[PDB]
């Protein structure tokens, strides 16, 4: 039921079965699916495609105008959102800018929590946790099972990798490969091992962590350079397809790749003062 | 005065002097005490009980659902707030859950100030201040007279003692002795002394100070472990009652209590290299 | 236009071209001014005063009560805003108090983004960028064409000159001179260098550029102590006028000015190790 005391334009698409409450503004061309609801105090901008089962929470704005300043008014924006999310109190989701498409998107079954914001062009995928005042600059893309911490930030144009920890605070300012966990390290982040926590409650077995982990020790451990263990990565996965979303994040890398930048003091060479 | 543009459900008991302003919308069972002032667009959550003389701005939302996996709808929950409070725009307080009690509960005399949140099962006791962007995760307890400073985070059951004063952007994973000051170790948080400020302020004297910081060395500057300090501690809040919050706080920590790990560079035996 | 749902006290002097939308709330003795929009569910404290052409979004809350222990109801609080801003989703900006002038004032063609906090007392200035999650505490003032990242915190009574970039969640505690980029030292902030691509975009030259850098490395390079940098910058000042910024914020300090604590190790002193 749309209750009296909301403003839709009579342009809007609302399924039957939504639930739009009191004191909601909903703007031009808006489609809102079946069992969607909407508490209160919530602002649904022009052109804003939502699916089904949503629960979306008072003062979420969704779909309005971009933080950019290359946009001007005449551009189209848009925000699209799946099926099965809950969008928490004073989340902020903006609608894509011209110089991409113009496109804003969230998968399905996510939990996108207080203050949380998605900015213009982002590209959110599904099973994501956004704790409590993430902030997510233009341009990111969150692969599934992801979870970001509180307050956690990132950077325009970086990645996080499927099934990716990323703690309290962190800085994200370079593309984070999959199952990886990250910590703060008090002004940007560091690769703190594999998500080993995530990954075993997800139904991860023995062989597949085993084979996540020598990938880790490829990528920070062996002494490498990123050109020989991607090399050393790409044949890994071969053989052992749960590795593939490494070959995605690191081979399409737009900002470069998460390091650990004090590698050389734990790595193999500093570890093997002995024979055998 | 209940404002004719408000919404408020019809077995909610608002006293006659509560003033209930434009475009609130207050649930079912909820009961708001004498003299509260509910500014503007404020929602409040079924169930929620509010004292006396509160003072609640716009787009703060309390009682309301409790991010929490382990919930569901059917579960109770519940806000409890005292008397006497201040709490300012966009801060969102949830109820309880199941696994406790499924109450969130708030005393008096406190501020809470722009975006903070106070997550389900949280125990805030009186005269705190919460300055802007505090994070308090599920089952957090704040003492009486604390002062998290702004942007500061309290992971799960973390407890922050009486008089304690918590630095910018500091984070709390383990609790917090009463009368600490707390600084940010970038990631993390350290003790940097005693609360003199606040305790001064409040009418401790000389004599309180001088045992309160005698127990900060005990704790943190004599080379003892947790069990022999604790030990010592215990007996000197025999005879100065002024300790007694120390006994609480450590003898029923569930995280562990908050320690320099740098305290071996600093404490007696590092500063004793004469006799006499 | 003023919306037939929006909240408008009698007093209030609204030009015919302002857009006040639906369910904003308009407090008493306020002037709004031509071609400013309010977009939904804007709140607009007493006594405030908005300029023409500005932009401001949903759940912001302007001119309200300072959050100032020292404030009592009966005290005149102000929030004077000029022409051409855009204030973002969840934005606020609190009124002055009677310590001062109470007065909280914001100047013309600023981008305040989402979550943004202009605490009691502040003065910004024109063509600032505070980007999301911004704090500023009481007294702080902004420069000119400052940019102030994501989630930067500013304590009281500091100075941020014209021109400066402060990076994602630094913590600024002293003034920052003109030009200069900040980044964050995990807790607190540092001098990184000069702000080269703000200052190229806005039209400076070389020779410009030049004399800043100079200053640069009077300041933070040249092992002098501040008495005697500050000696050499007024005389600097003398020839080239671009530098006049740096007599007015090192001049007028209230907080002391931002330092290299770590300078000695990167100094002229550090780095001469041979004639010539």
């Given at each position: 039921?749309?209750?009296?005391?909301?403003?839709?334009?009579?342009?809007?698409?609302?399924?039957?079965?939504?639930?739009?409450?009191?004191?909601?503004?909903?703007?031009?061309?808006?489609?809102?699916?079946?069992?969607?609801?909407?508490?209160?105090?919530?602002?649904?901008?022009?052109?804003?495609?939502?699916?089904?089962?949503?629960?979306?929470?008072?003062?979420?704005?969704?779909?309005?105008?971009?933080?950019?300043?290359?946009?001007?008014?005449?551009?189209?924006?848009?925000?699209?959102?799946?099926?099965?999310?809950?969008?928490?109190?004073?989340?902020?989701?903006?609608?894509?800018?011209?110089?991409?498409?113009?496109?804003?998107?969230?998968?399905?079954?996510?939990?996108?929590?207080?203050?949380?914001?998605?900015?213009?062009?982002?590209?959110?995928?599904?099973?994501?946790?956004?704790?409590?005042?993430?902030?997510?600059?233009?341009?990111?893309?969150?692969?599934?099972?992801?979870?970001?911490?509180?307050?956690?930030?990132?950077?325009?144009?970086?990645?996080?990798?499927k099934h990716?920890?990323?703690?309290?605070?962190?800085?994200?300012?370079?593309?984070?490969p999959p199952y990886?966990?990250?910590?703060?390290?008090?002004?940007?982040?560091?690769?703190?091992?594999i998500?080993?926590?995530?990954l075993?409650?997800?139904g991860f077995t023995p062989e597949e962590m085993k084979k996540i982990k020598e990938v880790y020790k490829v990528l920070?451990?062996?002494?490498?350079?990123?050109?020989?263990a991607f090399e050393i990565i790409k044949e890994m996965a071969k053989e052992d397809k749960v590795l593939e979303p490494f070959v995605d994040?690191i081979?399409?890398?737009?900002?470069?790749?998460?390091?650990?930048?004090?590698?050389?003091?734990?790595?193999?060479?500093?570890?093997?003062?002995?024979?055998?």
């Amino acid at each position: 039921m749309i209750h009296s005391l909301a403003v839709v334009h009579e342009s809007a698409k609302i399924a039957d079965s939504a639930i739009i409450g009191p004191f909601c503004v909903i703007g031009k061309n808006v489609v809102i699916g079946e069992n969607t609801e909407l508490k209160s105090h919530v602002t649904i901008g022009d052109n804003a495609v939502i699916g089904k089962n949503n629960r979306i929470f008072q003062y979420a704005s969704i779909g309005d105008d971009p933080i950019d300043y290359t946009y001007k008014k005449g551009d189209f924006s848009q925000v699209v959102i799946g099926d099965n999310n809950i969008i928490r109190e004073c989340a902020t989701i903006h609608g894509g800018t011209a110089k991409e498409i113009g496109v804003t998107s969230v998968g399905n079954n996510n939990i996108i929590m207080c203050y949380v914001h998605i900015g213009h062009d982002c590209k959110i995928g599904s099973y994501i946790n956004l704790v409590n005042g993430v902030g997510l600059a233009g341009h990111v893309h969150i692969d599934d099972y992801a979870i970001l911490s509180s307050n956690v930030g990132v950077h325009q144009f970086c990645r996080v990798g499927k099934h990716a920890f990323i703690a309290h605070a962190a800085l994200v300012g370079k593309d984070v490969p999959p199952y990886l966990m990250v910590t703060a390290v008090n002004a940007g982040s560091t690769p703190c091992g594999i998500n080993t926590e995530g990954l075993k409650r997800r139904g991860f077995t023995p062989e597949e962590m085993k084979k996540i982990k020598e990938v880790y020790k490829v990528l920070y451990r062996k002494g490498l350079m990123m050109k020989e263990a991607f090399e050393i990565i790409k044949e890994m996965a071969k053989e052992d397809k749960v590795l593939e979303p490494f070959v995605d994040v690191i081979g399409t890398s737009r900002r470069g790749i998460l390091r650990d930048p004090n590698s050389s003091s734990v790595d193999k060479l500093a570890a093997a003062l002995e024979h055998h």
